[PDB]
Amino acid sequence: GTTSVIGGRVDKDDIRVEAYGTIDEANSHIGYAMTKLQGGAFIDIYNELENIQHELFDCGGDLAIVEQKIPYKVTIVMVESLERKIDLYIEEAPPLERFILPGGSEAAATIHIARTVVRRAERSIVSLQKEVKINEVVLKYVNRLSDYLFAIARVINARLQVKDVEYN
Amino acid sequence: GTTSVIGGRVDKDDIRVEAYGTIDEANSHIGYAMTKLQGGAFIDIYNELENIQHELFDCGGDLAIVEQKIPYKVTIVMVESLERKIDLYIEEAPPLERFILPGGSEAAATIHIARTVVRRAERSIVSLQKEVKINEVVLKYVNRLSDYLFAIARVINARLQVKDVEYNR
Amino acid sequence: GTTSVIGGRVDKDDIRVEAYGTIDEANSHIGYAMTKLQGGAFIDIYNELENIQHELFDCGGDLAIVEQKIPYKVTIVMVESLERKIDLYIEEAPPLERFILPGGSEAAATIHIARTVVRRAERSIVSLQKEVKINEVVLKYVNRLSDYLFAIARVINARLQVKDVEYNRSAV
């Protein structure tokens, strides 16, 4: 009925468990999207995604810490790293002049799914924060991550010469 | 901790955000399934899915309308459209004689996943509706959409010469 | 705003519906993963997953039963079956001493997603059990299933010669 966390134990359906459990779910979706980005044209994105998976483990670990039992690993440095990539990718992709619908190339499509799962994880983290103090940087990281995912989804389509699917 | 919606702002974990966010999740699964349905053999289903992505996006917009600054976009006409297609596809598919397990062709399998996500979205909309007034057509649309997805999943397997996976020990 | 279940009716957003609805979601991911495992190299895992889809369907049926209207279908025998396969696959897979990134081959990746959805279903079942009586065996089954999925995910990658990627916090 309960599970152990870092510095204590909580019920298996505790919002804390839901939080890092959904981070795990998002990390798994990214893992799948990566199998679609093994092309030589995406070595950079694949490599960045791979690192993000480790950082997601960092996020899950931090969220599992009760009363700062051990040091937090997610820092503002990792958030700013994502922000720089987001800027670069927005620059690479064609100008955004229409509302985008999720889809296009299969790689971009799976990235859009991962994007929504990351956003779902963010909501769970917000819920956790409402009852216990957390590494607030984790929330910022996950928030920027969905923006990063949206950005590379459009870059993935563009590199493959596929127009983004637009609301029209 | 909050996010801007149409007419104001709400907490990021507000049941309203969970609702349109999950609608977005379902829409993304549909986008992925569509990448497996581009052939000439699926032009009818693919076009209907293209339209559904728009209506799903509209559903999300209607759920994000806190301070009704604008009229809702999802109408009953769109729900009836799904109902007619559901009957059409049930007719096309083989007789349903056993319980169906999700799977079969890759295309059908992804459509089945989308179906379960649409149902998860429906549950969030039900919860939202209990707390605030919503465009009730959205709930009806989402409810019909999962039946439509189930229907085309079977049609997809049939067209692809694959038998549906059945519960049969 | 309600839905029919076995021996009654409940609100469509009832924790009970969330539970079997998520079992359904997990079952659908398994079904998709199965399309990637039809090769001769995975006959054993594919057949086990075929059976698991039935058991998962049974889990949902058991969760939809209000006040033991009918006998439960999920039994401890099926839980033990999972446990035996778990040891078997941990034995086949290379030694594991660190957390690893979920992914690798397309098949393993989809299995990892299924694993996380099964765990999400487990949380809903835990919540359900706090409100009403349920077939406790279902909770034990879903609990073991996520470990089984983790195990075959690593085996699938191993069989495809895909090496696990260990978490970069090397002291963990």
DSSP string, C15-75: HHHHHHHHHHHHHHHHHHHHTT--SGGGHHHHHHHHHHHHHHHHHHHHHTBSSSSS-----
User: Which H or E element spans position A8?
Assistant: strand A8-11
The SS3 of residue A4 is strand
**Distances from the Cα of A57 to the Cαs of A52, B143, C100, C142, C172, in angstroms?**
9, 36, 9, 23, 11
Min Cα separation C53/chain B (Å): 7
CA-closest candidate to residue A99, choices C24, B73, B153: B73
Is B165 close to C31, i.e. CB distance below 8 A? yes
Report domain extents, chain C: 2-172
Q: Does A53 touch chain B (CB under 8 A)?
A: no
CATH 3.40.50.1110 fits A2-168, yes or no: no
A115 is in an annotated binding site: no
Q: What type of residue sits at position A31?
A: G
- Helix, strand, coil percentages (3-state) for chain C, rounded to 5, are 65, 5, 30
Quick one: how far is CA B21 from the chain centroid? Answer: 13
CA distances from B92 to B86, B88, B113, B166, C135 (A): 10, 6, 22, 18, 39
Q: Is A124 within 8 Å of chain B by CB?
A: yes
Secondary structure class of A131 (helix, strand, coil): coil
Greatest Cα-to-Cα distance within chain A, rounded to the nearest angstrom: 52
- d(CA B120, CA B130) in angstroms, rounded, equals 16
Please, is C70 exposed, middle or buried when counting C-beta atoms within 10 Å of its C-beta (0-12, 13-18, 19+)? exposed
Per-residue tokens: C125: 């079942």
Rounded-to-integer distance, Cα A134 and Cα A142, Å: 13
Retrieve residue A78's tokens.
């990792």
**Dihedral class, residue C74 (left if φ above 0, else alpha if ψ from -120 to 50, else beta):** beta
Rounded to an integer, what is the distance from CA A19 to the centroid of its chain?
Answer: 13
Interchain contact B85–C (C-beta under 8 A): no
Residue C117: CB atoms within 10 A of its CB come to 25
Return the H-helix or E-strand segment holding A11.
Answer: strand A8-11
Residue A36 main-chain phi, psi, to 5 deg: -90, -5
- Residue A131's Cβ-count burial label (10 Å; 0-12, 13-18, 19+) is exposed
- From CA A42, how far away is CA A30, in angstroms rounded? 14
**Residues of chain A contacting B22 with CB distance shorter than 8 Å:** 116, 120
Q: Could you identify the residue written with the tokens 């819920």?
A: A127
CB contact (8 A) between residue B13 and residue A117: no
Please check whether residue C21 touches A, CB under 8 A: no
What is the rounded CA–CA span in Å between residue C53 and residue B101?
7
Our measurement of the distance from residue C82's CA atom to the centroid of its chain's CA atoms, rounded to an integer in Å, reads 10
Q: Which CATH class is domain C2-172?
A: mainly alpha
Is B161 an interface residue toward C (CB < 8 Å)?
Answer: no
Chain A residues near residue B49 by CB distance under 8 angstroms:
none
Q: What is the CATH number of domain B2-169?
A: 1.20.1200.10
Compute the distance between CA of residue C110 and CA of residue C156 in angstroms, rounded to an integer: 11
Collapsing DSSP states into helix, strand and coil, what is residue A78? helix
Distance, CA of B125 to CA of B42 (rounded, Å): 31
3-class secondary structure, C13: coil
- Cα atoms found within 13 Å of the Cα of residue C81, Cβ hemisphere only: 13
* Chain C hits for A27, Cβ within 8 Å: 101-102
Tokens for A84? 């720089």
Experimental technique used to determine this entry: X-ray
What are the C-alpha distances in Å from C32 to residues B49, B104, C29, C144? 20, 8, 5, 20
Instruction: Note the resolution in Å, 1 decimal.
Output: 1.9
Please write down the HEC assignment for all residues of chain B: CEEEEECEEEECCCHHHHHHHHHHHHHHHHHHHHCCCCCHHHHHHHHHHHHHHHHHHHHHHHHCECCCCCCCCCCHHHHHHHHHHHHHHHHHCCCCCCCEECCCCHHHHHHHHHHHHHHHHHHHHHHHHHHCCCCHHHHHHHHHHHHHHHHHHHHHHHHCCCCCEECCC
Half-sphere exposure of B55 (CA within 13 A, CB side): 25
Residue C8 φ/ψ, nearest 5 degrees? 155, -160
Q: Does the distance separating the beta carbons of B167 and C54 come in below 8 Å?
A: yes
Find residue A5's DSSP bridge partners. A8
